[PDB]
Scaffold this active site. Structure first.
Site, mmCIF file in Angstrom:
data_model
loop_
_atom_site.group_PDB
_atom_site.id
_atom_site.type_symbol
_atom_site.label_atom_id
_atom_site.label_comp_id
_atom_site.label_asym_id
_atom_site.label_seq_id
_atom_site.Cartn_x
_atom_site.Cartn_y
_atom_site.Cartn_z
ATOM 1 N N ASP A 112 73.288 -39.288 49.419
ATOM 2 C CA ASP A 112 74.061 -37.774 49.831
ATOM 3 C C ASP A 112 75.392 -37.855 50.114
ATOM 4 O O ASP A 112 76.189 -38.029 51.260
ATOM 5 C CB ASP A 112 73.451 -37.659 51.272
ATOM 6 C CG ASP A 112 72.992 -36.031 51.221
ATOM 7 O OD1 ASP A 112 73.877 -35.373 51.298
ATOM 8 O OD2 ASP A 112 71.845 -35.588 51.412
ATOM 9 N N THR A 113 76.205 -37.881 49.033
ATOM 10 C CA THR A 113 77.792 -37.829 49.241
ATOM 11 C C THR A 113 78.025 -36.549 49.815
ATOM 12 O O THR A 113 79.256 -36.630 50.265
ATOM 13 C CB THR A 113 78.270 -37.729 47.611
ATOM 14 O OG1 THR A 113 77.645 -38.811 46.896
ATOM 15 C CG2 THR A 113 79.827 -38.160 47.789
ATOM 16 N N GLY A 114 77.025 -35.777 50.024
ATOM 17 C CA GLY A 114 77.456 -34.430 50.963
ATOM 18 C C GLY A 114 77.599 -35.033 52.301
ATOM 19 O O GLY A 114 78.645 -34.473 53.084
HETATM 20 O O1 LIG Z 1 70.477 -30.535 55.530
HETATM 21 C C1 LIG Z 1 71.194 -31.058 54.487
HETATM 22 N N1 LIG Z 1 70.562 -31.279 53.398
HETATM 23 C C2 LIG Z 1 69.730 -30.060 53.050
HETATM 24 C C3 LIG Z 1 69.469 -29.549 51.768
HETATM 25 C C4 LIG Z 1 68.166 -29.153 51.087
HETATM 26 C C5 LIG Z 1 68.528 -28.819 50.022
HETATM 27 C C6 LIG Z 1 69.632 -28.259 49.214
HETATM 28 C C7 LIG Z 1 69.666 -28.025 47.815
HETATM 29 O O2 LIG Z 1 69.174 -28.765 46.900
HETATM 30 C C8 LIG Z 1 70.732 -28.901 49.686
HETATM 31 C C9 LIG Z 1 70.766 -29.388 51.100
HETATM 32 C C10 LIG Z 1 70.753 -32.380 52.612
HETATM 33 C C11 LIG Z 1 70.173 -33.534 53.011
HETATM 34 C C12 LIG Z 1 68.571 -33.438 52.876
HETATM 35 C C13 LIG Z 1 68.182 -33.344 51.582
HETATM 36 C C14 LIG Z 1 66.686 -33.276 51.800
HETATM 37 C C15 LIG Z 1 66.097 -33.485 52.789
HETATM 38 C C16 LIG Z 1 66.769 -33.776 54.028
HETATM 39 C C17 LIG Z 1 68.078 -33.606 54.175
HETATM 40 C C18 LIG Z 1 72.335 -32.424 51.984
HETATM 41 O O3 LIG Z 1 72.148 -33.468 51.090
HETATM 42 C C19 LIG Z 1 73.310 -32.727 53.049
HETATM 43 O O4 LIG Z 1 74.701 -33.036 52.432
HETATM 44 C C20 LIG Z 1 73.504 -31.832 53.907
HETATM 45 C C21 LIG Z 1 73.986 -30.551 53.789
HETATM 46 C C22 LIG Z 1 74.761 -29.718 54.856
HETATM 47 C C23 LIG Z 1 75.882 -30.443 55.594
HETATM 48 C C24 LIG Z 1 76.535 -30.035 56.508
HETATM 49 C C25 LIG Z 1 76.221 -28.649 56.837
HETATM 50 C C26 LIG Z 1 75.349 -27.815 56.111
HETATM 51 C C27 LIG Z 1 74.397 -28.577 55.142
HETATM 52 N N2 LIG Z 1 72.362 -31.542 55.001
HETATM 53 C C28 LIG Z 1 72.540 -31.541 56.280
HETATM 54 C C29 LIG Z 1 73.085 -32.774 57.014
HETATM 55 C C30 LIG Z 1 73.905 -32.906 57.937
HETATM 56 C C31 LIG Z 1 74.482 -34.122 58.344
HETATM 57 C C32 LIG Z 1 74.330 -35.214 57.791
HETATM 58 C C33 LIG Z 1 74.961 -36.611 57.886
HETATM 59 O O5 LIG Z 1 76.437 -36.425 58.147
HETATM 60 C C34 LIG Z 1 73.399 -35.427 56.619
HETATM 61 C C35 LIG Z 1 72.872 -34.154 56.410
#
Ligand SMILES: O=C1N(Cc2ccc(CO)cc2)[C@H](Cc2ccccc2)[C@H](O)[C@@H](O)[C@@H](Cc2ccccc2)N1Cc1ccc(CO)cc1
EC number: 3.4.23.16
Lengths: 99, 99
Positions: free
Chosen positions: B25-27
């Protein structure tokens, strides 16, 4: 663009003649984008990730300019608190995750 | 490894002598991880992403192996439906998002 890792790969993307900070997220599979004004065809759905599931609008064929590089892709617009350039866009700019 | 197979860059990771599928998750900024067993020495934190806010356990210095690459990092353990590998680990394997 080559993004190392000491910082976040955020980019002022251009979708729907709009501009917002994007968060390159190889974790997601598509390009989600906080709600906004985006004209075009879209399908309503709900993504379920961390915390819960929200609603979005699969906007297929949206010109998103990442870092100045034209890149069309499917932008799921919903009540997300961020933008997520997922795989659907990491395949348009031709990204490579090398480590 | 250079991964350009435009697909989900998942990897069987080894955390706390365990094994789960990891979603590069580079996000995200750190390596979140579904609930599991970790070594006493963590701190509670709340992440608010898509859908709502979940609670995890910021574990620091955990030998998380990725694709057979010994790596240590901060693994957050909470009610997350996936093993998130954020930048905290993309800095250990020297990842680079070239597009
Ligand atoms: O919900 C998150 N989705 C959910 C998601 C679902 C579907 C899509 C479209 O396909 C995109 C994103 C991903 C992680 C994930 C994927 C699958 C199952 C469970 C989790 C994402 O890849 C991550 O980047 C951030 C995106 C994000 C970040 C900040 C604010 C809003 C959204 N998140 C939440 C997240 C927050 C903090 C951390 C730790 O720092 C990790 C994840």
């Amino acid at each position: 663009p080559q993004v190392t890792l000491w910082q976040r790969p955020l980019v002022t993307i251009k979708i729907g003649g709009q501009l917002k900070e994007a968060l390159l997220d190889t974790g997601a599979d598509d390009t989600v984008l906080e709600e906004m004004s985006l004209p075009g065809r879209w399908k309503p759905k709900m993504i379920g990730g961390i915390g819960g599931f929200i609603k979005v609008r699969q906007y297929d064929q949206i010109l998103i300019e990442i870092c100045g590089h034209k890149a069309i892709g499917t932008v799921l617009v919903g009540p997300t608190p961020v933008n997520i350039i997922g795989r659907n866009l990491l395949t348009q700019i031709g990204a490579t995750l090398n480590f």
